């Protein structure tokens, strides 16, 4: 049913994602990590003990956050009408190429010009401290901040983002898709519902929808360049062991 599609996707968004825009905006208005001293201060309370370099510690914390978000995005996609009806291989393909586009889109909700939220809202790491790290760890979030700054200027809310993320996942352009025509039909319904929602929620910007279409293309390019950084770390950083779920996602992308 397309009459209740926007309400159902928004509800699945609020149900499955521990962090959203209205929650992050409340916190951003919370320990601050701005140097090596405050980083160790935060890790003493938010990380458990069972030694590696600080760049690898932030790497493992960030990749762990991605693993949980992939699980949330999987459950979110299950609540999208028609997704569970696809073949199991098609569901894998949609998530494989879609999760990181949705992750970096959703990352904008916890970012401002000065930094981003970490540790489920309990910490705030500054933009300069991330740039002050050694290469290639300092070249990771900088293009994400740049994307987030232009994306946040659109002033979308969780109701807009929920439909945006749904359109990202249900993309008939992913390589190796089987039921291309039916997934394209699913995308058409979500995109059309997103079009009407943007018309009602943002009547002051009647060209907001083509703006969001360009952000979808910006995200795919941001992800492809991000996967190149993943391979650099995988090949030239032994202490940065990569999570098996993330190994499977980036493999053959």
């Amino acid at each position: 049913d397309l009459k209740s599609l926007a309400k159902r996707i928004y509800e699945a968004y609020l149900k499955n994602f521990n962090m959203n825009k209205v929650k992050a905006r409340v916190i951003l208005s919370p320990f601050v990590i701005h140097d090596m001293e405050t980083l160790c201060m935060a890790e003493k309370t938010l990380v458990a003990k069972l030694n590696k370099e600080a760049e690898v510690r932030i790497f493992h914390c960030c990749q762990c956050t991605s693993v949980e978000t992939v699980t949330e995005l999987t459950e979110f996609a299950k609540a999208i009408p028609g997704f569970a009806n696809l073949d199991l291989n098609d569901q894998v393909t949609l998530l494989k190429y879609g999760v990181y586009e949705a992750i970096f889109a959703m990352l904008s909700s916890v970012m401002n010009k000065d930094g981003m939220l970490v540790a489920y809202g309990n910490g705030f790491i500054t933009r300069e401290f991330l740039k002050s790290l050694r290469k290639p760890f300092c070249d990771i979030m900088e293009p994400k901040f740049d994307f987030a700054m232009k994306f946040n200027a659109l002033e979308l809310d969780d109701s807009d983002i929920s439909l945006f993320v749904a359109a990202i996942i249900c993309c008939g352009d992913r390589p190796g898709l089987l039921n291309v025509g039916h997934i394209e039909k699913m995308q058409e319904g979500i995109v059309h519902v997103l079009r009407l929602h943007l018309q009602s929620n943002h009547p002051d910007d009647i060209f907001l929808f083509p703006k969001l279409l360009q952000k979808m293309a910006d995200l795919r390019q941001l992800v492809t360049e991000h996967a190149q950084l993943v391979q650099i770390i995988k090949k030239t950083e032994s202490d940065a062991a990569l999570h098996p779920l993330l190994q499977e996602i980036y493999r053959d992308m």
Partner: peptide, 10 residues
């Protein structure tokens, strides 16, 4: 069998 299939089959 892949790990992404585990999250989808659950």
């Amino acid at each position: 069998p892949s790990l992404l299939k585990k999250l989808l089959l659950a």
